[PDB]
Design a protein around this motif. Structure first.
Motif, PDB file in Angstrom:
ATOM      1  N   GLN A   7      39.661   1.849  22.705  1.00  0.00           N
ATOM      2  CA  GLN A   7      39.542   1.586  21.264  1.00  0.00           C
ATOM      3  C   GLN A   7      38.088   1.623  20.826  1.00  0.00           C
ATOM      4  O   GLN A   7      37.790   1.971  19.682  1.00  0.00           O
ATOM      5  CB  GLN A   7      40.209   0.247  20.861  1.00  0.00           C
ATOM      6  N   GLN A  15      35.647   3.606  21.810  1.00  0.00           N
ATOM      7  CA  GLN A  15      35.367   4.993  21.466  1.00  0.00           C
ATOM      8  C   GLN A  15      35.651   5.250  19.976  1.00  0.00           C
ATOM      9  O   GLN A  15      34.800   5.799  19.257  1.00  0.00           O
ATOM     10  CB  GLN A  15      36.218   5.950  22.330  1.00  0.00           C
ATOM     11  N   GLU A  16      36.841   4.832  19.528  1.00  0.00           N
ATOM     12  CA  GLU A  16      37.359   5.209  18.202  1.00  0.00           C
ATOM     13  C   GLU A  16      36.974   4.307  17.014  1.00  0.00           C
ATOM     14  O   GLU A  16      37.353   4.615  15.880  1.00  0.00           O
ATOM     15  CB  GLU A  16      38.890   5.401  18.244  1.00  0.00           C
TER      16      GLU A  16
END
Ligand code: GDP
Ligand code: MG
Length: 660
Positions: free
Chosen positions: A654, A656-657
């Motif tokens: 998560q 990363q995003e």
């Protein structure tokens, strides 16, 4: 000269919360020791003892210049503003003094001021610091009539004719203060008995200790970190500072009194270095000062042996001999050239071109030891900087590609999009200090930015891709064609370029050009625009044109291949998993336990020290921007912390995003 004796050295720091009187106290001490600023160590004389006062610029006490500085001092004077006693920041220098293990005495300053209270200092040293203060002195008078000092150790008293430091008198203690003096004298003897058998067998038997036994006993208890003797006065109105100086010689350690420093041999052995002036030479450079009379001045502490004027030393960090041209000590008002600096001592050397701070200096044929671990800790906080016009841009570089000769830990660059200057340190605090070491110290009237972190990007899958730049452009053809394979390297390894071209398939001439294109494209990742690392690039094929091929052309083709390799490579974000050391009063243990976890952290282990606790932690610096006035929001202005780099991790799913 005066004839060096180790037992008569006294290497000290004056520590304090901002506005308590650190500088005034220092300045009066230089006034009183001189009867008969800038410098990173000022030296002076009192009774027959050299006092080396070590400067420690630190409007905040959190950084990394205070793990070095505390290896170079032996003792300290902690100065409290008396209207407060202890403030936040008093609390936090106490913690470092405790953690690094440095004997200290307390000076309750500002006794002339309105609010001043000995007792709030002491009570607030007991409660909040766990200090075991001992009352060495009582005040005669309050605030505006504060006029005298009683030495409860010796049962003597001093009155001050004026506020100029110029009329002091030893009186018997005024009758109206005698019972209070006797109360606190007997408390002193009681404390003295806990560090000396003979004093105990005197107390039981109803007998006065000699003053030398008492001095020796409080000295012993001070240096083995069990008691903090407290003195008072007013540095501004010139009372008590000459008795503070007497307390430096009585109670603060010589270099004989604290455990010897530890260094490392190249063969890995951790070794104690003894303060023997005739052993081999070991010394630390602790501060470089661009000086405007002799030039580069490197300040050193000698731990072992004797550094000599016009001898050679060998810098074990770098790998090189350096001529010590000259040796200086800095007094309040003057410099003194000296022939030598021996074990226990501090001074400055002239000569020395490539010794920077933290470097070990040795004999030349002396055992090569290292005193500070080899490592430049990664630069992990970037920053934008607008200087303004052409009398600023041109003269900001004047002291950046010059000012780095004093602190070479940081780097400077220029964002791949924005044509400007970007500055890079190693923690929020590290950089708070640097922009306004410059607008002031270089008359640069200029524009403030706000700080960003330094993530990186890399791939996790070998790919195979191409880069063509084929264009009619500039009334000519441009042709460049490369083919590369790109491969993950293990974390940390950095960059590798392999040239596997077969026989003119790309002309040589142009193989440097493609390389140029790859590193420039490597500055900007696809996910989030940050620099790419830990890849092996292999140029194995491509093509050219007989007139249309160029360096410009192959440079862009290389940019394009590498751009495309990274996007196609199951890319991924590297964050700095970096190390805190949150000191906190035990009362708020769980509060910063769960606050440090709501900024991403796996807690490494918390150990107890003093009347408090030391929660060491893992936390990506990104979710810790402005931890100073959030830790001291959830700990009532009694917390501290110290922050640095450790490694780079792949952020989980998560994480990363969120960043896009
Ligand atoms: N009332 C009074 N003011 C003092 C005393 N000592 C220092 N100050 C003042 O406090 C202010 C801050 O002192 P300074 O030494 O610069 O504080 P520092 O931040 O700890 O270096 C200055 O105005 C000093 O003159 C004191 O003995 N009495
Ligand atoms: Mg100051």
């Amino acid at each position: 000269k005066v004839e060096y004796d180790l037992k008569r050295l006294r290497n000290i720091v004056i520590a304090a919360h901002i506005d308590a009187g650190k500088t005034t106290t220092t300045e009066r001490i230089l006034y009183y020791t001189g009867r008969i600023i800038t410098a990173a160590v000022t030296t002076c004389f009192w009774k027959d003892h050299r006092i080396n006062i070590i400067d420690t610029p630190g409007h905040v006490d959190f950084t990394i210049e205070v793990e070095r500085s505390m290896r170079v001092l032996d003792g300290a004077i902690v100065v409290f503003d008396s209207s407060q006693g202890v403030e936040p920041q008093s609390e936090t220098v106490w913690r470092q003094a405790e953690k690094y293990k440095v004997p200290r005495i307390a000076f309750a300053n500002k006794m002339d001021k309105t609010g001043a209270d000995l007792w709030l200092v002491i009570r607030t040293m007991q409660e909040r610091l766990g200090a075991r203060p001992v009352v060495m002195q009582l005040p005669i008078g309050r605030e505006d009539t504060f006029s005298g000092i009683i030495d409860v150790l010796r049962m003597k008293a001093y009155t001050y004719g004026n506020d100029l430091g110029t009329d002091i008198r030893e009186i018997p203690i005024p009758e109206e203060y005698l019972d209070q003096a006797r109360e606190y004298h007997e408390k002193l003897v009681e404390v003295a008995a806990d560090f000396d058998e003979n004093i105990m067998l005197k107390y039981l038997e109803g007998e006065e200790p000699t003053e030398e036994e008492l001095v020796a006993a409080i000295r012993k208890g001070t240096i083995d970190l069990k008691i903090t003797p407290v003195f008072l006065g007013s540095a501004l109105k010139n009372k008590g500072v000459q008795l503070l100086l007497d307390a430096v010689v009585d109670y603060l350690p010589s270099p004989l009194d604290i455990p010897p420093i530890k260094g490392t041999t190249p063969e890995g052995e951790v070794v104690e270095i003894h303060p023997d002036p005739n052993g081999p030479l070991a010394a630390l450079a602790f501060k470089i000062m661009a000086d405007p009379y002799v030039g580069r001045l490197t300040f050193i502490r000698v731990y072992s042996g004797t550094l000599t004027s016009g001898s050679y030393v060998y810098n074990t960090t770098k790998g090189r001999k350096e001529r010590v041209a000259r040796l200086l000590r800095m007094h309040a008002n003057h410099r003194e050239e000296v022939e030598e600096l021996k074990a226990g001592d501090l001074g400055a050397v002239v000569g020395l071109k490539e010794t920077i701070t933290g470097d070990t200096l040795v004999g030349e044929d002396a055992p090569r030891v290292i005193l500070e671990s080899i490592e430049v800790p990664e630069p992990v906080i970037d920053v934008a900087i607008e200087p303004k016009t052409k009398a600023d841009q041109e003269k900001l570089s004047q002291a950046l590609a010059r000012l780095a000769e004093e602190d070479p830990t940081f780097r400077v660059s220029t964002h791949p999009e924005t044509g400007q200057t970007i500055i890079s340190g190693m923690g929020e605090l590290h950089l708070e200090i640097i922009v306004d070491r410059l607008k002031r110290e270089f008359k640069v009237d200029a524009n403030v930015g706000k700080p960003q972190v330094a993530y990186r990007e890399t791939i996790t899958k070998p790919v195979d891709v191409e880069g063509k730049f084929i264009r009619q452009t500039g009334g000519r053809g441009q042709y460049g064609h490369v083919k590369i394979k790109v491969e993950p390297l293990p974390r940390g390894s950095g960059f590798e370029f392999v040239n596997a071209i077969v026989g003119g398939v790309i002309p040589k001439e142009y193989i440097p050009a493609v390389q140029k294109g790859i590193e420039e494209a490597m500055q900007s990742g696809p996910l989030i625009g940050f620099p790419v690392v830990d890849i092996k690039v292999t140029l194995y094929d491509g093509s050219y044109h007989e007139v249309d091929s160029s360096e410009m052309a192959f440079k862009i083709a290389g940019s394009m291949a590498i751009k495309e390799a990274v996007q196609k490579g199951d890319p991924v974000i590297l964050e700095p998993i970096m190390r805190v050391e949150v000191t906190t009063p035990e009362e708020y243990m769980g509060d910063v336990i769960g606050d440090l976890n709501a900024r991403r952290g796996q807690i490494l282990g918390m150990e107890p020290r003093g009347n408090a606790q030391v929660i060491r932690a893992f936390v990506p610096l990104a979710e810790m921007f402005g931890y100073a006035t959030d830790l001291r929001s959830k700990t009532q202005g009694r917390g501290s912390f110290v922050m640095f780099f450790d490694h780079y991790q792949e952020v989980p799913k998560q994480v990363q995003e969120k960043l896009i």
